[PDB]
Amino acid sequence: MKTQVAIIGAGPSGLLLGQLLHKAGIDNVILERQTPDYVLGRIRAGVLEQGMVDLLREAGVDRRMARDGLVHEGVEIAFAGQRRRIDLKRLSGGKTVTVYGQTEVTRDLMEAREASGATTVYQAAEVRLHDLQGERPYVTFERDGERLRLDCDYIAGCDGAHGISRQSIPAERLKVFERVYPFGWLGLLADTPPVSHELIYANHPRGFALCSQRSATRSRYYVQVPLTEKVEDWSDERFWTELKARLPAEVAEKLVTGPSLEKSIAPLRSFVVEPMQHGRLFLAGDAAHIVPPTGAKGLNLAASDVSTLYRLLLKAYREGRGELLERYSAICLRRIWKAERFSWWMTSVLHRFPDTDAFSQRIQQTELEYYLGSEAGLATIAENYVGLPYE
Numbered sequence: 534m535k536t537q538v539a540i541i542g543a544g545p546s547g548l549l550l551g552q553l554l555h556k557a558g559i560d561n562v563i564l565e566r567q568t569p570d571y572v573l574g575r576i577r578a579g580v581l582e583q584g585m586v587d588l589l590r591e592a593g594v595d596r597r598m599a600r601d602g603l604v605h606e607g608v609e610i611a612f613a614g615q616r617r618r619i620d621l622k623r624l625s626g627g628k629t630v631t632v633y634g635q636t637e638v639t640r641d642l643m644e645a646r647e648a649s650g651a652t653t654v655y656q657a658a659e660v661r662l663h664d665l666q667g668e669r670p671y672v673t674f675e676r677d678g679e680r681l682r683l684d685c686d687y688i689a690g691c692d693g694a695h696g697i698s699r700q701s702i703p704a705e706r707l708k709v710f711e712r713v714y715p716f717g718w719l720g721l722l723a724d725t726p727p728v729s730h731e732l733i734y735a736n737h738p739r740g741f742a743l744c745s746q747r748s749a750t751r752s753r754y755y756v757q758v759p760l761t762e763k764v765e766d767w768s769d770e771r772f773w774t775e776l777k778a779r780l781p782a783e784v785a786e787k788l789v790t791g792p793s794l795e796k797s798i799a800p801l802r803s804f805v806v807e808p809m810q811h812g813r814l815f816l817a818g819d820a821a822h823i824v825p826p827t828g829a830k831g832l833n834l835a836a837s838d839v840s841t842l843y844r845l846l847l848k849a850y851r852e853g854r855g856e857l858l859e860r861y862s863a864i865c866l867r868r869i870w871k872a873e874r875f876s877w878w879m880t881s882v883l884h885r886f887p888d889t890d891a892f893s894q895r896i897q898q899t900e901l902e903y904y905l906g907s908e909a910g911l912a913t914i915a916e917n918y919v920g921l922p923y924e
């Protein structure tokens with residue numbers, strides 16, 4: 534079989550790229566290791582930047598989002614017995630963020646693709662990439678037990694943190710930047726109404742806590758935990774008790790608790806590779822970079838990588854300007870590093886780090902006091918949170 538663009542991975546990045554390309558008339562095939570069900574079981578993201586929202590509209594998949602998504606104009610940070618609201622809309626010059634689950638976004642994309650008739654191969658096992666620096670690269674995979682070959686012009690590596698694509702680039706060509714944090718987030722999804730109409734990020738001596746939501750009757754909570762913790766050691770009641778201990782009394786008092794629909798621990802880390810391409814292979818999303826969840830940027834950065842790749846692929850196919858593809862990495866990395874810096878900052882000021890001295894603890898507290906009390910300081914948080922413009 535042959536196609537124009539082979540896409541490895543049917544997560545948000547691959548699906549969104551596939552939809553945009555299909556609409557523009559560029560044939561593409563998506564190869565996914567897992568089943569549609571497994572992919573749909575991943576909870577993950579809840580916060581979307583306006584840029585991503587606009588990209589979903591451009592891809593023609595925003596009906597349900599426009600209907601069910603919750604537009605947020607502010608967010609709160611709680612620390613040292615204070616609750617500060619950052620008016621995102623006012624301080625960012627009118628921008629806002631939208632709360633709509635990643636599960637929902639993926640479901641919408643999957644249905645759109647399904648309907649268009651575009652090719653998607655689930656349970657594509659043993660994916661291998663070949664002749665990346667040739668004029669004719671190809672992908673091999675096994676379906677049932679037979680090895681099939683897919684010829685194409687370009688390959689988009691949208692296979693996430695553990696994908697094969699990044700591993701297919703000669704190690705000596707890539708420079709890696711990584712930072713592993715000494716804690717993870719224990720998340721809990723409950724069919725309960727959220728404690729607040731806006732998100733609450735809390736810095737507490739016991740550790741970080743976050744109050745988020747999916748809708749008016751579905752909530753998502755997180756608490757910072759050591760990497761040595763096992764989700765089996767955390768019953769629902771232990772979670773609720775701990776959550777309450779980290780929130781302001783007035784907030785903890787209004788909390789409606791309930792059995793969890795999903796519980797899991799996500800370790801925190803930063804990871805960037807340079808460049809993000811090799812020959813005819815281009816990396817996008819988590820395959821190229823990981824950001825801690827604190828700044829709500831992961832999926833959002835996948836969106837800008839995809840928007841950039843789609844636009845450059847259009848110029849190459851439609852305008853015959855293939856040389857522009859060499860600019861992919863430079864363009865993406867400018868936005869990536871800025872979102873990485875923001876996510877790193879948010880993580881450092883909101884969490885409790887082990888073995889930090891008195892001086893560091895006071896500086897952490899003063900960072901919050903300063904940034905949440907100065908108009909210029911609040912503006913730096915707001916413009917970064919709603920999302921820096923796409924280039």
Ligand SMILES: Cc1cc2nc3c(=O)[nH]c(=O)nc-3n(C[C@H](O)[C@H](O)[C@H](O)COP(=O)(O)OP(=O)(O)OC[C@H]3O[C@@H](n4cnc5c(N)ncnc54)[C@H](O)[C@@H]3O)c2cc1C
Nearest residue numbers: 542544545546566578579580692693818819830831832833
């Ligand atoms: C707890 C948590 C909270 C988060 N909150 C937010 C948020 O609020 N906002 C935000 O912007 N981001 C958030 N993120 C990040 C966001 O979820 C990710 O950045 C997003 O999932 C990345 O999408 P992707 O498509 O690049 O990769 P993934 O979702 O990982 O999809 C990659 C796909 O490729 C497939 N694949 C892998 N290997 C192969 C292979 N060898 N062959 C073929 N297929 C393969 C995988 O099965 C998978 O389906 C959060 C993440 C976590 C963990």
